[PDB]
Design a protein around this ligand. Structure first.
Ligand SMILES: [Cu+2]
Ligand SMILES: [Cu+2]
Ligand SMILES: [Zn+2]
Ligand SMILES: [Zn+2]
Lengths: 153, 153
């Protein structure tokens, strides 16, 4: 299996560790871990194009979108490669993450290694919010925490 | 990738931003930027295997060494891919890094994106110290700061 890892940090209390595993180069990527310091409820969760933390999360750029598509949710056909939807934080502020995705990869053209994982202030509306921003970003508000996705042992 | 970037951070005061540029895939990588808070003099500067900051710089693993060679200086044939030698900090504790290297790459087998850049406590002896540790790490000592190398624009 190829494996990756990401430590998420920001200016506030949001922090976590997200693991990635892909047994086969043409198979799905398992994504799992935990993020703490979040408000209860849904938080947008995306891979952004650049692994540039020189301005914190602000320098990561837009959603990783090598097929030049509109923003959606992970199970939509029309989505950015970087669109991993929402994580859910419980009343203790902890979001336990467990996702499988077959659009991101840990190798080849949809490789997310060296890009930035971001957790957001608000819910991602999955591109169904009915305004231009919905189809760009999903209206997920500010970037609370982020990190560069690295190769793991 | 034709560009990459890395933000260096540690437990102490060492911090900086290192840029990578490779205009041709068959070509040298330019490495440059500024690291501050270093003691005056020579500091080991390596790419380590894993982009894993889960236990600080310790979890980055050993030097990136896909050809299973011994440790050397960047001018040696016998070197780890990750062996970029030393950087020099001035009397104000600033290293204005400027390196060109043709063994590291921003694509292919020697790709360093998703791995960890590390700046060290001590001088790298470049494999010339006469002990077993010289042939593994160059006797560069502890990991003062590090960061995951990310794709930039
Ligand atoms: Cu986002
Ligand atoms: Cu090192
Ligand atoms: Zn998107
Ligand atoms: Zn080495």
């Amino acid at each position: 299996a190829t494996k990756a890892v990401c430590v998420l940090k920001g200016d506030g209390p949001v922090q976590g560790i997200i693991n990635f595993e892909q047994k086969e180069s043409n198979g799905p990527v398992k994504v799992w871990g935990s993020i703490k310091g979040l408000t209860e409820g849904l938080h947008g969760f995306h891979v952004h194009e650049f692994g540039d933390n020189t301005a914190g999360c602000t320098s990561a750029g837009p959603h990783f979108n090598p097929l030049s598509r509109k923003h959606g949710g992970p199970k939509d056909e029309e989505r950015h490669v970087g669109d991993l939807g929402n994580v859910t934080a419980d009343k203790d502020g902890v979001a336990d993450v467990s996702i499988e995705d077959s659009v991101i990869s840990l190798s080849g053209d949809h490789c997310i290694i060296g890009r930035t994982l971001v957790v957001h202030e608000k819910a991602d509306d999955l591109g169904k919010g009915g305004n231009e921003e919905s189809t760009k970003t999903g209206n997920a508000g500010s970037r609370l925490a982020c990190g560069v996705i690295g190769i793991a042992q």
